Symmetry: D2
């Protein structure tokens, strides 16, 4: 029955566990955004940067891996439709910010347009081209009055001009202090570290509609206060209240299950059905099942599914392409209701999203900007049994596979023996079910020994086949082979 406005919106900060600081936005008991931080974020850090290798170009900002820099992102003041081999010389030093953190193998997006975020404004020092209103918001007037050689945040709504000036200045101080520690050293160095998860919250998530800001630990709270004030949000001060229940905070507000759902592949919807979220090389793919009038059911579920998808998108910090497979509905009107629901349900999201109509296949494609790395990238690792595939090849299939591999290697001229080192049950199978087979191979391709040793240090999909050439063979024992061959 969720209607925005009915209940309070609190920001719950849970800081009783050293190893995972947690910030929830909750509306009533509905978790609608989560942020965790563990002893950490590198986005928005600024660096003195030396160009590595134009081939836009790559960079050494000090990290184990160089960063990526787009021609689009080079500056006017840093430029001594042209080719980059023109504006920037190798080894050339330049001020650099991180737009996108390191994902998989990519370095990072860096930009020489540098942006500075405060409570109410965002200085764009390195560019006048971009600046103006929060597409979300008397201020066009208050804006002009300001000095400069920038943008106003969704949070200036309830404030005057001095405050913007108060902000605008502090920003500048930074900018100055910024290009000063830049004119004062070698090139490959960190200049500015982004604020931590609590600051960021206070800076970026404090709409006027945030009722309270609860906190489960005193030390932090205190830290919290100083953070507000220093942050120019004096008003909120009264709002920060220390929680002291025996029952844990996120638990009292009944949001831990919801936090967990961020981690499941399936997520149950209100009326019963569910969504399954599956990630893949290319894209994330969400699918949708009904629970128990048909046409109705399909509609209603898809509607729930939209709302949920919208928040899962956020909790799991999901970025890039996303392909949703809504239940199929005949009435075109339904198809629009549903896309609309979706658009509606993602309006609060801070990330740029782009949605799109249900295809004739019943698929809906969308895209959501990478704000930060996702759950799965940052709190999961690739299942090391299957190596991402989520399946394991049945035993025979694999065995017969291996058998063939064995004969092939047996065929090569100059072969003395072949050692197949393999999961136990494979060995069982090759050495019973397929005994004759292996025999045949051995009688046929002649004086070639086929060793197939079982090995409990292996599970099925993994195995090795080695080929031992006439000459190189030893008097080793079958079961001693795995260790002998441990260097491979």
């Amino acid at each position: 029955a969720h209607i925005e406005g009915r209940h309070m919106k609190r920001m719950l900060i849970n800081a009783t566990q050293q190893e995972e600081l947690r910030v929830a936005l909750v509306d009533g008991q509905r978790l609608y955004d989560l942020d965790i931080e563990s002893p950490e974020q590198k986005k928005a850090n600024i660096y003195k940067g030396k160009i590595t290798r134009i081939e836009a170009a790559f960079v050494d900002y000090g990290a184990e891996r160089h960063g990526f820099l787009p021609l689009k992102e080079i500056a006017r003041e840093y430029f001594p439709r042209p080719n980059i081999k023109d504006v920037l010389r190798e080894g050339q030093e330049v001020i650099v910010q991180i737009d996108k953190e390191e994902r998989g193998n990519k370095g990072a997006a860096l930009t020489t347009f540098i942006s500075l975020a405060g409570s109410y404004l965002v200085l764009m020092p390195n560019n006048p081209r971009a600046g103006g209103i929060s597409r979300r918001i008397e201020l066009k007037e208050a804006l002009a009055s300001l000095e400069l050689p920038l943008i106003v945040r969704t949070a200036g709504v309830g404030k005057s001009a001095e405050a913007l000036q108060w902000d605008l200045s502090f920003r500048l101080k930074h900018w100055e202090a910024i290009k000063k520690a830049a004119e004062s050293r070698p090139a490959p160095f960190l200049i500015h570290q982004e604020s931590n998860v609590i600051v960021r919250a206070f800076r970026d998530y404090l709409r006027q509609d945030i009722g309270e800001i609860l906190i489960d630990n005193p030390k932090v709270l205190e830290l919290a206060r100083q953070h507000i004030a220093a942050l120019g949000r004096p008003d909120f001060s009264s709002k920060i209240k220390l929680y002291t229940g025996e029952i844990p905070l996120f638990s009292h507000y009944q949001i831990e299950s919801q936090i967990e759902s961020a981690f499941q592949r399936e997520v149950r919807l209100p009326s019963g059905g569910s969504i399954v979220i599956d990630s893949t090389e290319a894209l994330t793919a969400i699918d949708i099942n009904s629970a128990r009038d048909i046409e109705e059911t399909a509609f209603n579920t898809n509607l729930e599914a939209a709302d949920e998808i919208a928040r899962q998108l956020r909790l799991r910090d999901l970025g890039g392409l996303i392909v949703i497979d809504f239940i199929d509905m005949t009435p075109v009107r339904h198809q629009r209701a549903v896309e609309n629901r979706l658009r509606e349900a993602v309006r609060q999201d801070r990330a740029r999203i782009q949605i799109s109509h249900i295809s004739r296949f019943g698929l809906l494609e969308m895209s959501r900007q990478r704000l930060s790395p996702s759950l799965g990238e940052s709190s999961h690792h690739v299942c090391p049994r299957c190596s991402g595939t989520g399946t394991v090849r049945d035993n025979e299939s694999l065995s017969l596979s291996i058998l063939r591999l064995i004969e092939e290697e047996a065929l090569k001229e100059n072969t003395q023996e072949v050692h197949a080192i393999v999961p136990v049950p494979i060995a069982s199978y090759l050495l019973n079910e397929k005994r004759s087979a292996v025999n045949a191979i051995e009688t046929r391709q002649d004086g070639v020994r086929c060793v197939i040793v079982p090995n409990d240090q292996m599970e099925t999909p993994h195995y090795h086949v080695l080929r031992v050439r006439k000459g190189e063979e030893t008097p080793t024992l079958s079961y001693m082979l795995p260790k002998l061959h441990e260097e491979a």
Copy 2:
């Protein structure tokens, strides 16, 4: 450099392994379709069928699980835009064929329109509505001449009218024999079993362009011959030749690697880049990476990628929705080249496909009809570490997770102890890194014992938390707990 026509197209039948009979269509050494059969296929089997429960309706054709029957698929002669609660009464007997085998939880598609496949025709006894030309093909004339109260196959091209009559008859005999063993027994029984993999090949894949039909085993070959003749394909007889190389057949024709590619998640393309195939609840998703002029590269790779996708679609018997993420190309002309390539490259496919333009997201959606079950369904099983997800949740994350679960259970009124039974390293972590935590819980929620026993019979994601109520507790030993609790 593959140009259709250059080289011979042989059908390689590999039957030297009892447990996996293998039929390859190869063009030169290019594998372009594979069929494996293991001591098996249920599609096209016919049954006497008793209606279970109208709610189209479900069926008992004898299998552990009832089958699905669409109103669309009920007959005129079996009907004693209306509702099914009208045409078919519960328990009612009716002739039934399988359109689609059992997938996951679904029963099967059954149809009371029954189709009978021979070399040149397909009798549609139970319906005159559908019949006519192979959209792939003097015969419109040869067709009419026939008796009846049906369709002509892509293979009638090189034959006369008597042969169609010769076929047409044999079909009818069957039809008769069909509804006779149907009028002669109870209802829940198998009537017709589909032919095996070799017959099916000969029946369905012998275009005039098939040069030879090689075979690696004598017994089968002989069987093969009788299969041709009985199949009314006398011409091919001369074409069936027994292979006798020491080197295995599929190996001599260098197609085993290609057969294997059907099983990898990544598949390298000619010029270097690759495609990654990822399956998911909803759909399969193929992604495409370049290897090393940009615009060129992207184009050329996407082109290779199309060809490959087309054959992988076939080797892996992939069905349903498929979403391809081609490398992104600016020139719209390229986007059409690529979709076209794809269409071209899938023309030979026997399954109905539907393709579609590259979306503004760079995605291409397509659909390919389920002919049979896919590799992954039929020769893989769900990785039992991760349970499909392809990831495992990092240790702390999981632990902290468990910790919270523990406190929560500790809170419930009437609790005496809580036993967390968990992977070893979780236990390590909860009992060192998080010792104080667990302590706190215990001192706080009072005289409540928190047992956290490590267990080597578990890997990380799996765990148990049990709650032992005041009264129900025992004097068991920490490490004895897992077994005590083995009934859960």
Copy 3:
């Protein structure tokens, strides 16, 4: 340099661990006897006893297992060189004490001569035949003065006659209370439970030379006091002192290593060499090695070895036969020095010992009475790898063994298959090194399948061979066999 008398003898009671109460007699820092008790001793308990089955006779004193009763141990008053089939009728009730606890399979020694231990006397109510002096000790006179229709303890030395009377009485009270709860119920019941480890100490180990009695816990201490007083040892009261060091008691007195030595197979001697204690079905066997004048060395070491053996005998509570293999010495005089040393070194032992001369083989046999069960019986369990033997049969030996077993079973008429289920490396070996072998068997003894499945749930010595008769065979998978056969 240990001379008895030099340093204090304290009794250290260590009771800071709920699960193991520990009482050490230490002389200086030399541990010279240890007693542990864990939440326990059954010796000296008294029972109402019903005769089970004359065949002396067995008994039901209530325990899961009946007890053993010697004709020698039946009474005059309980007797309604004769045969027991005479004195005691089946089911006959009689008062019963435990002389020896349950060892391995034996029930227990029970006696109808019942003995009652107090600080200074031992009432022998059920017999006047035995009574008199502690062979270890004015009292022959003090003894007579007493009433009666009994023995004086080694501890009466420093006391008068009233105290013996004070003791003598309390004893009698018990005796009376004893045969009263005996005349007041069915037969199969416990009558008297022996005191706990602390009481027993105070009762049985408090010679006048015990300086202090330290204790590491207050609650127990207090309990301790009441135990002394109730025990009629008022004098010692001043002697009981509570220990309060941060450093653990047994640790401060540097005796924990020595306590541990009770648990090693090897035990280093002062001058360097060592003794190895090995227990066996029959007897314990101690062996003795020198460390680095020969004749000297041998002598001196054997001498150390004697002292040590004497205390190990005690710490490990070793009973029954013991065979020591001293280093060999030519000079007969040495052989006597050494036996004597031994006799000397075991004089303090409370158990009856019998020693004996070094045999011509250099062996010394001795015997030491079972006071209680030994370390190894009470804090060890039979190594479950080797099953007592302390060796594992090398792999080939075992394999070849199994191979032969396999052929044999293959030979039996009416055999269809033989399944060898075996440790992995055995399987490796049988299925590579011995492949031809297994082959031969199979080609020879005909159409008989030899399945040899590796199994990681087994280590080498354990294995199974099953024989599957014509008829009883299944289509199971090689590696599925272990589970199929798990009922055996």
Copy 4:
């Protein structure tokens, strides 16, 4: 019912398995001696030997380990009651034979008295002091007639003087060839390798009472013949017969179970009871249990037990001291019957034995000369769970043990953390049952972290405790510790 003489005595040679050549002496179907050889024996090999270090003295005869040489065993001709520092100078070369192979840590007995074994004589070239009759046997006369500057075997009984001369010569040839390849090279070299297991048999075990010599393989048989002839035993030739049953040789003669008994700890006796053989640092110890007139039973069993012990002594090649614990018998006459039985039953044994009367403890000590290494030394290895002890310390005991160790290490000044790395269930126990304990330690001995990580790469008795000093600590994870510490 075994009476020597009733049945044939055959020598069964089983040589159908490359990896274990087997020679059985069987009387009827009673195995009464076994010899196995695997692709091997070093006793009786001769070497050129360089003295390493007088301290008799040690030697380098080429083996990884030097050999032991007794003053008693130096020669007259090699001597340039005195001290060895006199007769033999360091580095001095001398002819050397192996009396006793390498056992455990000992090198080997070597002797400069060299003995040469043929069918009928034994040349003692390097000494005239020793020579004469087989204490087991017209020949005193035949002996004298011989030339020389030696002993007659138990096998000369049925032969003349020429044969002794024929032998005597061949021996000499060897002797000459011996000291020639000795005068013709450096010092550290092998001179003579002892014959293999089949030769040795034929040479040493062919009494006239050996009926047949069966053989299960043709190639070997043939080899066998040439071995006889070359061995001067022409008579036996007719006796060597090739076995050709499908049923394996040792199996047909029903002796495989008996061969196996050589490997069990328990061995059932005819009438039911059994003997348990237990080996130990010092000595082997045999114990004896009855099965179901008492006095009778005890006697009869002990008698069986004697016979069995006698043959087990042989099958298991048992050497050194042996202590038998016969069932106890009152009648002294019985005690002599039994010792006598034993003496009788070991008369055939080739090794020197010395027996002795039953002690007052009921123990019988005996000694049997090491002919070769024993089963357990040569086909077993030390159980690696328990490390010889045959027991494992119960869990708590071990844990509490570890706990104490932990506190102790916590106490040392300059300690930052202590890591206990331990079998899983220990960790369970220390971290539940003993949680407070570990807590206490930590609160008490202050800011000292006690890490106790469970580890599945360990079983209970093994564990590690490390102490990490202020300074040397890291930010490693609890469960990452075992690997971090894997270098220890």
